Amino acid sequence: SSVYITVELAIAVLAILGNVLVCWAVWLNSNLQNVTNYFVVSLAAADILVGVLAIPFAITISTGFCAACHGCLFIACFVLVLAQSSIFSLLAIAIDRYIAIAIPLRYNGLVTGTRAAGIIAICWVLSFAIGLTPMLGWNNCGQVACLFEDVVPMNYMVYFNFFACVLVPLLLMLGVYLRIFAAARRQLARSTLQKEVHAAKSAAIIAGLFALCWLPLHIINCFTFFCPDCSHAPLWLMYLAIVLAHTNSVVNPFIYAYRIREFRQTFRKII
Numbered sequence: 001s002s003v004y005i006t007v008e009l010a011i012a013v014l015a016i017l018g019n020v021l022v023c024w025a026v027w028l029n030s031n032l033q034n035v036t037n038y039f040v041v042s043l044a045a046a047d048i049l050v051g052v053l054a055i056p057f058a059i060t061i062s063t064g065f066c067a068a069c070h071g072c073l074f075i076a077c078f079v080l081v082l083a084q085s086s087i088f089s090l091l092a093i094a095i096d097r098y099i100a101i102a103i104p105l106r107y108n109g110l111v112t113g114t115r116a117a118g119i120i121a122i123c124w125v126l127s128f129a130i131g132l133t134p135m136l137g138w139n140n141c142g143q144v145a146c147l148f149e150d151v152v153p154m155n156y157m158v159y160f161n162f163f164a165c166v167l168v169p170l171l172l173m174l175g176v177y178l179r180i181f182a183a184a185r186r187q188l189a190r191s192t193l194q195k196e197v198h199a200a201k202s203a204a205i206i207a208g209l210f211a212l213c214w215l216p217l218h219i220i221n222c223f224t225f226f227c228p229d230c231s232h233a234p235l236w237l238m239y240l241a242i243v244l245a246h247t248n249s250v251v252n253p254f255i256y257a258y259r260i261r262e263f264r265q266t267f268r269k270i271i
């Protein structure tokens, strides 16, 4: 119990620090203000909020505080909007890499800073609508005690939250990355191509780490929903899955530092 709170607080601190470093690095350095880096800083902002609010909210839900219904749904479902925003940002990054690699000549024409910010705003607005759907409808609410099992319907999680809003973007961007690397192999000028592949590899790792972290908890929810005859998953397994899902927030600043040389140099400059 106490171990969970301590590890969650440590994850929150690490996420805040790493992603504020990423945001500061992109803001400070003009060489790092690409089109893809706008999606990168949107994803960093999503991780910052995961650290600042989503993890304290998870701790409070673990304590099972009683409160009003709508506040309870907001506390339980704030992680959902941030995960969806991360999904949308990762998809935008994958499509940007595909545009940059498959059609380099018209890449600058197709994607523009104003277009990038627009897509970011639309994706952020859609993430709130998808994640906070329980507040509008689909409630098991009927001061209710805040338990994520009792309050948030599992039909929502296993159909709308997961099958349409995670697996579909996950599989689409898996196909996008496969097409990216197939086109990279077809195209092989050589110096520029290896920069695109290296950038695509870096942005595909942070995608692979996201799916690796989130599918444990999603599959546990699917097991809870599809087969009611079997008993509920153990509490320790549930907390481990939550911690694993939260761990994806801290990893990608380290990936940027390790893979992207400009990020590493400006990180060392900041510190």
Ligand SMILES: Nc1nc(NCCc2ccc(O)cc2)nc2nc(-c3ccco3)nn12
Binding pocket: 079, 080, 083, 147, 148, 149, 157, 161, 217, 218, 221, 232, 235, 238, 239, 242
């Ligand atoms: N299923 C589930 N449970 C929880 N917390 C409930 C933990 C619990 C589980 C069993 C129990 O008897 C008492 C408490 N948070 C959860 N977050 C998510 C989630 C976030 C994104 C997708 O699923 N699913 N999820």
